[PDB]
Structure formats: C-alpha cells, structure tokens
Amino acid sequence: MYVKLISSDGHEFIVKREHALTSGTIKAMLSGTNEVNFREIPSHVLSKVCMYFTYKVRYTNSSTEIPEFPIAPEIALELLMAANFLDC
Amino acid sequence: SMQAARLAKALRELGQTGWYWGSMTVNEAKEKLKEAPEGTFLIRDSSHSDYLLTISVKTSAGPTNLRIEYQDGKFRLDSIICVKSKLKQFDSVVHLIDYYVQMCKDKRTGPEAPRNGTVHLYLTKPLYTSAPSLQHLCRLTINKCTGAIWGLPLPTRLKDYLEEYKFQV
Amino acid sequence: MDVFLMIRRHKTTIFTDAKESSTVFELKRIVEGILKRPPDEQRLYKDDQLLDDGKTLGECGFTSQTARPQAPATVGLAFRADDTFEALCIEPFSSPPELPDVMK
Ligand SMILES: C=CCc1cc(CNC(=O)[C@H](Cc2ccc(OP(=O)(O)O)cc2)NC(=O)Cc2ccc(F)cc2)ccc1F
C-alpha cells in the first residue's frame, strides 16, 4: 500500500505505492523489499520529488484547474538530474 | 525544406507545452476558461479553414479568441486585428506566446488596452491539459533564470534536453 | 475539502492526505497503519502546538489553500517511549547548494 523512499542523507519518505509508480524507474524496481534506497539523491531533492508525485496524481486530469508547481531556483539543477534519473 | 523542418519543430515544441488542447471547440474553450483568472490562456486548433491555431484567453469580460496566422514560414497574430508591421513574426508558435507572455510579466503591457490601436494581448498563465513531467517543470525554471544553458554544470545529455525547449512558459 | 500533509518525526516523513472535516484522531489512525503505533501512543503538532484528538483538521488551522499537493502542510509526530512522551523533534532536510552565478 505504501513504499519507503530513502535519500542519500538518510531521510525516509513514505508515500502511496500508486504515487511512486509515477517514476518509470521506481515502476521497474517495484514491479520487478518495499524500500528503495537512493544513494545519490539528497533529502532536499527527494522531498520535492515526492511532492511532485502527489501533484501528478491529483492533477492527471483537467477537471480541476491545474495550479503551478513551484520550484526554487537553488534546487532546479539537481531536481532535473533527479527527475531524469527517475523518469518522471 | 528548411521551412518544412521549421514547421515540424514548431509542432514538436507545441506538444511539449502541456497547454496545447488540440481539437477543442470554441465553446469547450469558453467553458474551460469561464472560471479562470484574467489572462489565463491556452492554444488549440482553429476551426477555421485558413488557420492552424487559435489562442483562447480569459479577459475580464469573459473568454475571447485570437487566431494565429502562418504564412511563408512565420507565425504571427491574426493580421485582421492590426497592421502586420505591429504583429511580430516568429519561426515558432511557442516563441510567439512566450514573447507576449514576457511582455506582460515585464509590465511592458498590462490588462488595460492601449489608446492608439497597437496590439493588446494580456497573457499571464497557461491552462494545462495535464500535469507536465517533472523534467519539463525543471526545464521551465532554468529558462526563467538563464538562457546560457551551455555553461551550466550539467551533463551534455541534459543540456541537449534544455536546448529542445528554451521558453519560459 | 482535501488537505495534503507531511507527517514528520526524526528522519521519517509520511506523505498522505485527508479531508478538512477529518479529525486529529483519524490522522493518528493513518499513522498507526503505517508506523504500527496506536493513537494513544501518539502526539500530533502544528508547529509547537499540540492538537486535540477531537478537533477537525480545519479547526486546527489546516485549510485546502494552505495544504496543497504541491506544498503540503507539516504535522509533527511524537511517540510515547514507555511512560513518557518524547519531545517533538523533526530533523531538517539537507541544504541546497549555492546557486551558480549564471543563474543568479
Ligand atoms: C485580450 C484580448 C484578445 C483579442 C481579441 C480580439 C478579437 N477576437 C474576436 O473577435 C474573436 C474571433 C474568433 C472567434 C472564434 C475563434 O475560434 P476558431 O479559430 O476556432 O474559429 C477565433 C476567433 N471573437 C470572439 O472571441 C467572440 C467569442 C468568444 C467566445 C465564444 F465561445 C464565441 C465567440 C482581437 C485582439 C485581441 F488581442
């Protein structure tokens, strides 16, 4: 029902399994334990990736007007590399 | 044709926006924009035989529609509304939107209309059909901070992705 | 209606959602299912203020506008260690690097 995502600095993020499958990368490991350990994604990045999961799933349709997803400039370079690593 | 290639690229970029609604009717657009804040906009196929695309945008008086002309490899706003010399031309339709968006964000034009018959297009935020990918949301943020993506501390693969969509909206 | 949350304790963060009409007790029931600790062994905080089990999330200050999917509101979690409730302790996320000059 839930999976645990662990950042390189040791933070554990527990998110709904359906939400984690937003990531093509996580989809491969979880469909192919219920933990995933990201040795190269730090917590300030991983936390924002998890907010993205909530936002993609809530706003998959346009029934509700889709708000913007705010991203601090300081994280955008790593967030982009993380997003590319996770395929989401 | 270089022009054929420029048109196929413009259509690729349009598919990356997340705010291109394809074959949405003029009344479906009126319903979707009815509750949106002033300036909210989207792009969709035109119903008109002579035009490819139309902008739909919420004004304070309700949603309204502006066709985009494409002639000999350049996009510009429908030339029935103003003289063509005041309707800047673009190889890319997303670039066209970006330009007018950036005009409003930079407060060079506002929601009030000009008194001298020049172009009045108030654009604030696009209406997304669906949540964009995280990579693309990151891309938009980087474009909003710099155009010099090739000096960034990124691998060439991710600079190549940034280079595919340099717009801020 | 919906409020989106991060329940945080030490280095644990739970992403979940609830309704504005949900009670604090219902939230602990969500925590129990995931972390396996009954609600009478839990304390929940908005900032430094303890939340009374009988209140709705709306009555505690969680509205839909302040607890969005893209910006969830933080609920702090403190477990009962034998007789005593532990202090509220949430460990910070790591700090982002300095912005490169071109982006400044
Ligand atoms: C910020 C201001 C934008 C702006 C507006 C104009 C003038 N605009 C028109 O007078 C368009 C003409 C048109 C109508 C439909 C259309 O759609 P399509 O291309 O699919 O045929 C394309 C164009 N009239 C309407 O909007 C009226 C309407 C609205 C909703 C609806 F449900 C049905 C009709 C010129 C300069 C500007 F800066």
Curated annotation (Swiss-Prot), chain A:
GO terms for cellular component: Cul2-RING ubiquitin ligase complex; Cul5-RING ubiquitin ligase complex; cytosol; elongin complex; nucleoplasm. GO terms for molecular function: protein-macromolecule adaptor activity; transcription corepressor binding. Pathway: Protein modification; protein ubiquitination. It is found in: Nucleus. Ubiquitinated by the DCX(AMBRA1) complex, leading to its degradation by the proteasome. Keywords: Host-virus interaction, Nucleus, Transcription, Transcription regulation, Ubl conjugation, Ubl conjugation pathway. Heterotrimer of an A (ELOA, ELOA2 or ELOA3P), ELOB and ELOC subunit. The elongin BC complex interacts with EPOP; leading to recruit the elongin BC complex to Polycomb group (PcG) target genes, thereby restricting excessive activity of the PRC2/EED-EZH2 complex. (Microbial infection) Interacts with HIV-1 Vif; forming an active cullin-5-RING E3 ubiquitin-protein ligase complex (ECS complex). This is Elongin-C. It comes from Homo sapiens (Human).
From Swiss-Prot, chain B:
The SOCS box domain mediates the interaction with the Elongin BC complex, an adapter module in different E3 ubiquitin ligase complexes. Keywords: Cytoplasm, Growth regulation, Isopeptide bond, Phosphoprotein, SH2 domain, Signal transduction inhibitor, Ubl conjugation, Ubl conjugation pathway. Residues 19-127 form the SH2 domain. Changing K58R: No effect on protein half-life. Changing K125R: No effect on protein half-life. It is found in: Cytoplasm. Changing R44E: Impaired ability to mediate ubiquitination of GHR. Pathway: Protein modification; protein ubiquitination. Induction: By a subset of cytokines, including EPO/erythropoietin and CSF2/GM-CSF. Substrate-recognition component of a cullin-5-RING E3 ubiquitin-protein ligase complex (ECS complex, also named CRL5 complex), which mediates the ubiquitination and subsequent proteasomal degradation of target proteins, such as EPOR and GHR. Specifically recognizes and binds phosphorylated proteins via its SH2 domain, promoting their ubiquitination. The ECS(SOCS2) complex acts as a key regulator of growth hormone receptor (GHR) levels by mediating ubiquitination and degradation of GHR, following GHR phosphorylation by JAK2. Substrate-recognition component of the ECS(SOCS2) complex, composed of SOCS2, CUL5, ELOB, ELOC and RNF7/RBX2. Interacts with IGF1R. Interacts with DCUN1D1. It comes from Homo sapiens (Human). The keyword Transferase does not apply. This is Suppressor of cytokine signaling 2. The keyword Ribonucleoprotein does not apply. Transmembrane segments: none annotated. Ubiquitinated; mediated by AREL1 and leading to its subsequent proteasomal degradation. Ubiquitination is dependent on its phosphorylation at Ser-23, by PKC. Ubiquitination is stimulated by LPS. Changing C138F: Abolished interaction with ELOB and ELOC, preventing formation of the ECS(SOCS2) complex. GO terms for cellular component: Cul5-RING ubiquitin ligase complex; cytoplasm; cytosol. Changing K144R: Increased protein half-life. There is a cross-link at K144 (Glycyl lysine isopeptide (Lys-Gly) (interchain with G-Cter in ubiquitin)).
Swiss-Prot record, chain C:
The keyword Amino-acid biosynthesis does not apply. GO terms for cellular component: Cul2-RING ubiquitin ligase complex; Cul5-RING ubiquitin ligase complex; cytosol; elongin complex; nucleoplasm; VCB complex. Residues 1-66 form the Ubiquitin-like domain. It is found in: Nucleus. It comes from the Eukaryota. Pathway: Protein modification; protein ubiquitination. This is Elongin-B. The modification Phosphothreonine is found at T84. It comes from Homo sapiens. GO terms for biological process: positive regulation of proteasomal ubiquitin-dependent protein catabolic process; protein ubiquitination; protein-containing complex assembly; target-directed miRNA degradation; transcription elongation by RNA polymerase II; transcription initiation at RNA polymerase II promoter. Heterotrimer of an A (ELOA, ELOA2 or ELOA3P), ELOB and ELOC subunit. The elongin BC complex interacts with EPOP; leading to recruit the elongin BC complex to Polycomb group (PcG) target genes, thereby restricting excessive activity of the PRC2/EED-EZH2 complex. (Microbial infection) Following infection by HIV-1 virus, component of a cullin-5-RING E3 ubiquitin-protein ligase complex (ECS complex) hijacked by the HIV-1 Vif protein. It holds the Pfam family ubiquitin. The modification N-acetylmethionine is found at M1. Keywords: Acetylation, Host-virus interaction, Nucleus, Phosphoprotein, Transcription, Transcription regulation, Ubl conjugation pathway. GO terms for molecular function: transcription corepressor binding; ubiquitin protein ligase binding. Belongs to the Elongin B family. Signal peptide: none annotated.
